[PDB]
Design a binder for this molecule. Structure first.
Ligand SMILES: [Cl-]
Ligand SMILES: [Cl-]
Ligand SMILES: [Cl-]
Ligand SMILES: [Cl-]
Ligand SMILES: [Cl-]
Ligand SMILES: [Cl-]
Ligand SMILES: [Cl-]
Ligand SMILES: [Cl-]
Lengths: 219, 219, 219, 219, 219, 219, 219, 219
């Protein structure tokens, strides 16, 4: 378990992270953590490692791009003095290119995305024990579907950045791809982005695996 | 214009047709028709052919497959004594196979779909002045996506039944496919089924063209 | 098609234009465009000219007179940097004279109306590619009904102004008059102002015809 | 005062009479009567003739034609054992011909209207102490407007039936026509049917005058 | 009719006057005038004197004493530039003495009431054509009931003031007393203060009689 | 304490007893009892006699007269197999004579009231361990007010029936009358019927005293 | 009765005291006092000592610790100029240690609690006639349950402070303990803190006993 | 994994199982399963065993005891033709003895509980592929608390019935007891019954472990 006792773990990102969490503080309880992967992570950590006393904050905001995370970073991350920061961003940065293809300033293209996300990691890294970078995802099994293909480019940037900055790394697309060998996207997410409880469990498990969670602990 | 003065035109189908129409009666001019292609069709006919004196009934019901249509056909179609019946069904017949793949009783497979729709058309045809068969559709430009591929199969059945019964036919998939050369699905419908105003216009226009509507009447 | 690719088309006026659009920005989607003629115009443009990538903003506000448009012109029009501005105003300017006949300062009489609307066009014209002036209307077939007779005076001023300023021009009263040869006003609008979907289609079609829309495109 | 002590007075009609009255019972003093002319009539009688001890029932139902009145006449009128029955019906009988011109089954034409209303009056008359027949009305000052012209015809039928049956008669059209020499319809009722408080007062006053109400009692 | 053409008549007082009127302007329509005696007055004036074009404003506020009227007089009366001001206040000034008998600073005793109401009349009188002073009331027939007995003291002060300042005068208690010879208070007002439509008609008629209203006009 | 361990105590009456209790069951500890004297009685018994193990059912219904009690007596009382039945009825029996004086069928006059209540008590008495008869009341200190005078008459009937049947008796009027030496009715109940918390306490205390409750248990 | 005529009694504490009272003033009526022990106290005082004319204010706020009371003391207590202050605090100070055991700064430990509560009493005492200190409580009969055991430590501090400062003193835990010899906590409070009406009566009675209330007065 | 491909798994129980599931059908993937352990179980199975193709039905109903289960067993279990039935019942059977101790008919004592649950298991077992019996639980670490002591007794019955019938068994009490070595109940469930997300995870994990779930599949 990478996370130590008494430490503060802060999650930020878009609606997948937000999942209706309490604004502004996103702590004090679960209703406050929302009803998606963040809550599930915290539930499983408390169920299996109750003695850890990990404090968890949810700063997701629906609709955010990486450009939006930067604009609120000081107040919503730095000022919170987290020990661990998990970031999952990029869905909107890409989605806007496909749902509003003629409003191009709402689009965050890959080179701006890369430099901005890099900037967040570099700023934060000296201040925390660790960073976990989760890739964005798109629940679509065809690598050549345009939005899937773009999403994968963004996820490769995330992985680049995690390697270079020694951050932890969760390939959420890889976790979905495995399930997509069986299920058509509709069975997980009608809009290919916002998943069922099952999709949130896919995400939570992928995050827990990267931080060394054990489903049945050995010592 | 295939529809002639004084006639009663009855639309039946699923949510795409329903679009919040008034239940049970579904008529006429002031919101009972719902807020999608059916209301637009009726709007445009009134704007351009006010003297036709057409009455219009919306018997769409959210969720319906062709099995559901059969179960209420006597009360919602035959007992309304329509002159013209337009049918657009198959989206749920297909979609349940993909979004609830293990709930097989909810699925209406091609054999049930062909036999049922054929039977409804054959029985209705001598009771009415004419039938318009609209294909189902899926807003997805990749013919090899599995749900699009199945939807196209269901559409072939509709086309074949219309030819065999000398019904009017609207290929709604072809109408979307034209726009999908420019737009990714997300620009028209986040779930690839329930479209924007623009998608409802694609549908209304495809319906109108088939019934001989003119935007500006030539004579 | 007068409107070119990537251009911004801004609609302003009263409740007929507003039709419940999102405040303040009236863009980002259709819910944002409201549910009347503006939305229908945008739907039809996207259905038939999806490659245009026209951006459309709705600045209608319910209850407005031309005196109200002027008071918000800088923020709601100039600051938006539109390429095309469509104006439809005058219904309230006239209606107040008939529903509050003893509150005369709520009335905008024809000479103030003319100079004010002229002032808006002259200010705007150097800043945009084009202006479309739509007349007000009153859904009433008797030319001698007092409010109809006043409305027609205002519509003649609009046409004057469009001619003199080389603006495009939509005679909405003419479009309604044709339909009123068949339908009594009640069938279109119970208050003779706020129309059914059919009346909104009358308006949208009249606007589309003036900007060179083709229902089936020729090249 | 034609109404005498201890008597039960029952008003029936459409929305103009209903005005949100309590269903099914429609009585008595604290809001069950609704918020239009019926409540005003009852108010004024109580203010000026408190000792009359009149009981009042409101059986108005929004939407009703005379066909609808016939269908519930036994339960809503005869079974209430009223002493006096006031009827105001015909607005919807007529209006449906104009607002839904192609839905002919919703229309109640003059032959059905005369025969039905005649029959209801003839049957009720020997069961009760008296009947008050109020004309329908349309708030429109042009006798040649088509709906006003039809409404006036329906009113003649009411007048002729009242004379033939020695019923009291209130000409509600004449009462509006007097005010319409000063005001355009929009100042009293935006849809020309559902009036302001002032219109309900016009109605209440016309009713009261016919039953021999005095504003200040002479003796 | 004391009130002349085009003049502005402003009503102020407590909940009996307010009766749910629109804040802050209490004009522009009837919903804006609330649903009690003020609205009825305006309805009757418009029904019988539509050509007068009287503008009517309602500044009642629920819970007010005369101490509250003074605190808002400049903004809610003077600044409105009325031609006629009707005041009805004193119910709360007295009620507080009986429902909160141990919170004595919420009480406005008769000498403060008198001087304050006098001060309002004297301030206003040079600025307007006329003032109408309506007494408070208490719907209770026993002169010796403590609250009735106090209310009557306040009403005698009102009458004093009207005489001395040449204001018009409406004894609302006298109008209720007459009806209370027949009806127990419960039949008019369950709390002996807030009346039924009948009680509001009692009030409206008493006001109309004092300003010279004619139920059927003679010239 | 007249009520003994393990017994079921059932309260029936009108709104004073109801006070928003759960329908139909009306039991037990967590809000089903409503928010007036019945809940307070049950609260205090539990606070001071927790070991008594008393079960309590609230069958009060807003609006009821003794006629209404008779109509549901079999299902709401006899079929509950109570040990003790407390009845408080008569307020509406009387009040309808005053608030709806001309709706005579709603009135339950003294002959119907005595005969009915007598009959209910006689029939119930051998089926249960005991009966508590509570008078109705009116919060009005003037014995010569007409509704108070009638209420006192109805209370005499209750007292006489309790004596004749050896029922326990609570004179609720006497309990209010004591407080009314200090307070005007408005301090306890604006409508003279529905009291504050303090009035419900007056009632609860009067009930408790009659059943031998001790505030501090002597032994 | 310790409390004298015309005096102001102010209650402060957490949700047990607040019980939905009106913010900010918590006076003017009962709705304003909320629906728990404070309201019951006031009801019983008014029922039995109506002539006292005691003014009662409720400043409870849900969630408060003693640290929260101090932060609002000047505005919510001192500025109110009470004659008597009742304080009940400590439930949250302790609860946080058990429901958020890893957010230790939300915890108020016993030495901070003691000094803070002492500080409130010492500040206030010169300004008022009297102070009543109510212990916190926990509805749990096992003295060795951890939260019960902590609560008792806090209650012993309260008693210490009351003795040293000559404050009145209510041991709410003692009052509950007696009832807990019969009832399991669930029957009083599902969360062992927020009680039923019965628990609120336990509290109100314990407070009334300490201020010398008599259930039936002797002079 | 004890559950095998294509099978239907049906969960029944009380609120812990219900957790707001869709009534009556309780299936499948998009919210119909509710928001507690059942949805989590289904989520995790899908994340880790998507190919199993398991269908899941939630027939939990808030409030139920085993008596309630018997009454709807035919329609809610047998008629669903499940392959696997999981039962978790006993919490209310027990809790009613403690929260409503004097309402003995609401209690289901050990004899009724054993006989009923035994009978339901014996009857169901030959109709289905397998049964999973989950104990009830109480989140309370003191074995000598009276409700915990009774709950443990009911759990022994469940364990004994599962052994006798060769059912799978989940000891939910043991799963909570492990976490209760660290946390006081209030950190998991304020009422000791309805847990947080973390408690639902404790339950889901205990269920999954018993059916042979692997967090990471070995082969
Ligand atoms: Cl988002
Ligand atoms: Cl659908
Ligand atoms: Cl408007
Ligand atoms: Cl109507
Ligand atoms: Cl008031
Ligand atoms: Cl009642
Ligand atoms: Cl609290
Ligand atoms: Cl439950």
């Amino acid at each position: 378990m990478k996370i130590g006792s008494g430490e503060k773990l802060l999650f930020i990102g878009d609606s997948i992270t937000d999942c209706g969490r309490a604004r502004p503080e996103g702590e004090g309880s679960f209703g406050a953590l929302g009803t998606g992967y963040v809550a599930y992570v915290v539930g499983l950590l408390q169920a299996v490692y109750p003695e850890l006393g990990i404090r968890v904050v949810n700063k997701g905001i629906s609709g955010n791009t990486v450009r939006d995370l930067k604009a609120r970073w000081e107040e919503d991350v730095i000022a919170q003095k987290p020990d661990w920061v998990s970031i999952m961003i990029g869905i909107n940065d890409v989605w806007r290119q496909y749902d509003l293809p003629f409003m191009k300033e709402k689009h965050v293209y890959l080179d701006e995305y890369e430099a901005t996300l890099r900037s967040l990691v570099l700023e934060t890294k000296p201040l925390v024990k660790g960073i976990i970078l989760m890739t964005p995802f798109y629940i679509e099994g065809n690598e050549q579907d345009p939005m899937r293909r773009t999403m994968d480019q963004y996820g490769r940037v995330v992985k680049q950045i995690a390697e270079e900055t020694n951050s932890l790394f969760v390939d959420t697309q890889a976790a979905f791809n495995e399930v997509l060998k069986t299920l058509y996207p509709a069975a997980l997410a009608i809009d290919r982005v916002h998943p069922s409880v099952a999709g949130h469990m896919i995400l939570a498990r992928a995050f827990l695996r990267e931080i060394g969670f054990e489903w049945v602990r050995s010592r």
